[PDB]
Symmetry: D2
Subunit: 178 residues, 4 copies
Amino acid sequence: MTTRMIILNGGSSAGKSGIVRCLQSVLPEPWLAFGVDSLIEAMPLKMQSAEGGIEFDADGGVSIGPEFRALEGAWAEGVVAMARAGARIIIDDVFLGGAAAQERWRSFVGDLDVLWVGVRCDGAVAEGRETARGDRVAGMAAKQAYVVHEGVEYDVEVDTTHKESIECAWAIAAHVVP
Amino acid sequence: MTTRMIILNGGSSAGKSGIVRCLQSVLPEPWLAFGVDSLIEAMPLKMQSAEGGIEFDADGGVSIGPEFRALEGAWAEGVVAMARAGARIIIDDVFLGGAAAQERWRSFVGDLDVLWVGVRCDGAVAEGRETARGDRVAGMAAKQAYVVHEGVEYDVEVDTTHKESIECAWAIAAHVVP
Amino acid sequence: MTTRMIILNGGSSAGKSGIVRCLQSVLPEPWLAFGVDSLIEAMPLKMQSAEGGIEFDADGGVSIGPEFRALEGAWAEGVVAMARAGARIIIDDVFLGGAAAQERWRSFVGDLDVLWVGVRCDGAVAEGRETARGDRVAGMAAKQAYVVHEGVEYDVEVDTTHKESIECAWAIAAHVVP
Amino acid sequence: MTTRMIILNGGSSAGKSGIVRCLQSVLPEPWLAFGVDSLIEAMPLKMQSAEGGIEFDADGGVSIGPEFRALEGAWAEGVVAMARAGARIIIDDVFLGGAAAQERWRSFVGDLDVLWVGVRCDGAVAEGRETARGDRVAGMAAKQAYVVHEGVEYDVEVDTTHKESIECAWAIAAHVVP
Ligand SMILES: Nc1ccc([C@@H](O)[C@@H](CO)NC(=O)C(Cl)Cl)cc1
Ligand SMILES: Nc1ccc([C@@H](O)[C@@H](CO)NC(=O)C(Cl)Cl)cc1
Ligand SMILES: Nc1ccc([C@@H](O)[C@@H](CO)NC(=O)C(Cl)Cl)cc1
Ligand SMILES: Nc1ccc([C@@H](O)[C@@H](CO)NC(=O)C(Cl)Cl)cc1
């Protein structure tokens, strides 16, 4: 019943990264972090616009091709395999496909003990943060603030609109079975 | 016989990262990159000095505790699992333990089709690059330039002392069975 | 009476950078940003521990030698000269010496039209953010949260404890005479 | 006759940044570095595509509007003022307008003791490095490799095609009058 993998889902600028860094600092056992950003980084730069692999519209839009989806699948199985091997894994993703994305993750996780965390934040508030962070593709924060959660089932839900990262980290840590 | 995982070993500032970015650009199929640096990043910051996890001496020295070694093991199995799942994986590491480190990797890779690449660079030349890159822990380049290769068996060997990254990438790509 | 230079002072993690990026986005005329961080970057790496130039104690402490102070002076005169030349300049610093630091700045600014902004944030809250940002030298946020303001006179004061960056940017922009 | 400001000009990926970091490490007196990149950073993000301020064509092309040119002028006068104030200033720029750009700089420098350095690199070789560095706007290295030097007069010329950064730093330091 001991928790093997923590999986956070949230729109862009919702505050995921900062919670993950806080969780790593809060939790006593060492946890490895692997978000969707670290995946994008492990992919070839060409994979980044050359269709088949992710493409950002000037209006903060994101579209995923099959080339990308195939790589993402292999990666998913790798992190799950890390958990299964005994490592503690935190993963922050952006369920663009709502429940569909969660189903996709469930198929990989199998029967592993997972904590499904939901990170919410006000669309307008998240967009302001997008601006303060210096993000390039402006428009995402607002576009993803609500849709990414549709039909997604969580075990915990934090809202970073009025709560700090270190605080949402505490609410989440309390649901982690050692 | 098709190559599943490429594994580069080399001292610090030997030029590994740049070859990896070149390989990703050169090779036709998308390859995921996961070096030891990306691992360090996935670990909690505390894990970075609090004994048990990696510690950098002021003289460019590096020591690895058991806490770290355990996490590294789980990670190793995860990337191998990614290959096994069908993803193409490039991995740049620093075999501080020479052959011992390679044996450790062999135990995880199993019977997977791997390309063992060796990236060499002149100790003094590598140290100059360490300085030009703005690295903080000065001293590593020179300390690791030769020892990391002792007793290590490669399928290919490039030397970045007089050859460019894009060029070493070409010599390496030519040994990749599609 | 048109504002030539905006000068923010605040402890570490008080939120200065994000306000500066927001101001740049909010204000209609292009403003150049030059904090104390960009200065540290323009200095030689050796200047960073080799006494005479800034040194960070393991307890989040900071000490400035004369080598550093001399360079900082020349830099100060350069940014003022940029304003005088017609550029709009935002500057975020950390008045470690309270009023002393402000006097030091006044001597350089001369009779230039300046907006003295004060960015406050709860010491404990700022320290939590320090943790979420992944800062290395932990301890500064708390150590600087209050002292840096002692005896310092502001034209505006924002508190990022409960107000967002984009919001503090709005309160500040409203005091900028075009 | 003591050198007050060092000014390097070179195409993208020609190796300028690394020489600058080497010079800072080599030269005994602390030198402040301020390239054109640090300027771009001090400007508002909007200033980065919204015409009037710099815009990168998908083919590695760069165009500068008047909004940008005005800010650049004020900045130029600021760094010169820093030198005049007694600071030692290194500046790496990209003379897109060949001699025109140098004339523009001469008008700001005045009678200050300046070292005009020229950093050359093979267009094809520079483009390979552009790829290994992970630069986004591919195409610049090749487009700027030669034109940026047309009609420009140097006091020193280094070629990074076959010489290392630390080495070009040594050839340049030897022309610096203390
Ligand atoms: N499906 C998807 C994958 C990656 C991304 C990223 O570009 C980016 C957008 O804000 N995500 C993040 O910063 C997360 Cl850490 Cl919130 C967004 C959406
Ligand atoms: N065992 C070991 C693990 C990680 C590291 C890194 O700190 C660092 C030292 O240069 N390595 C790199 O930059 C590699 Cl990409 Cl060449 C060095 C050694
Ligand atoms: N005097 C002083 C100069 C620079 C610094 C920086 O190290 C650092 C500490 O948080 N400052 C910042 O991040 C500011 Cl932008 Cl708030 C702190 C204090
Ligand atoms: N005029 C001009 C100004 C800035 C730039 C930069 O985008 C960039 C292009 O490689 N320059 C650098 O990296 C320099 Cl350090 Cl070689 C290129 C050209």
